[PDB]
Structure formats: C-alpha cells, structure tokens
C-alpha cells in the first residue's frame, strides 16, 4: 500500500487538530454516521468521512482521508449528538470551525469503499 507522507508531525498513531472555515452552498463532502462495530452501547455513535472531492474546503484543509475520525467538533464531543447538530456545526455561526482529527493505525477500524470501478 504505497503511502506517501506529507509531514513528519503527522503520523497514524496520534491525534491532530483540524481547523476550517464557513462554507456556502450544498453539494460536497458527506459525513457517515452508520455504526455497526459496537452497537451495544446505544446513544454514543460516531462520525466519519464517507465522501470527499479534491479542491473542496475539506480538501484544501490540508489533508483528509475517507474514514477520518472526528473526536471533537468545535467543542462538541461525540456524547449523544443529533443528526442535525453536526451539519449545523459545519455552518454554525461560530467564527471558525475547530475540530479534533484522529487517525488510528491500520487494522483497528475497517476500510470504507464507495461505488466506482478501478482501472
């Protein structure tokens, strides 16, 4: 799995904060919240990136991958969150969007694969 590194400060066994800015219009990235790993503890789901295109706010952000793990959103822990709160936070009135990004090691979590062939 040829993986090129961008910055040493960025590893796969640590958490790195990700700051963003308010965007406009819809149609863009998508956040998946469908859990199935440990659905034993209701009210405590998690959020992850499902789709993402190059040149998008999340793109220029610096670095993102389909599966990223957000631990905190502008100070909103994954402690019981509605399905309309996250989105609202993405465009919240806040001045800036500061969230924590976590990227565990390869094996802990599965790999997301959306439609599209390969060649």
């Amino acid at each position: 799995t040829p993986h090129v590194k961008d910055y040493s400060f960025v590893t796969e066994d640590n958490t790195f904060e990700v700051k963003l800015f308010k965007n406009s219009s819809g149609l863009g990235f998508s956040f998946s919240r469908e859990d199935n790993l440990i659905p034993e503890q209701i009210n405590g789901s998690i959020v992850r990136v499902k789709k993402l295109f190059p040149g998008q706010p999340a793109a220029e952000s610096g670095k993102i991958d389909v599966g990223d793990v957000i631990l905190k959103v502008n100070g909103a822990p994954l402690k019981g969150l509605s399905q309309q709160d996250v989105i609202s936070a993405l465009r919240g009135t806040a001045p800036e969007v500061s969230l924590l990004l976590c990227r565990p090691a390869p094996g802990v979590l599965p790999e997301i694969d959306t439609p599209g062939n390969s060649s």
Partner: peptide
C-alpha cells in the same frame, strides 16, 4: 435484524 431506528442523508 433487517431493521434500524434512524438514518442519515445530509451533506454539505
């Protein structure tokens, strides 16, 4: 089992 509770379909 072949069922759920809530779903999602919102993006930006």
């Amino acid at each position: 089992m072949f069922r759920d509770f809530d779903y999602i379909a919102d993006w930006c």
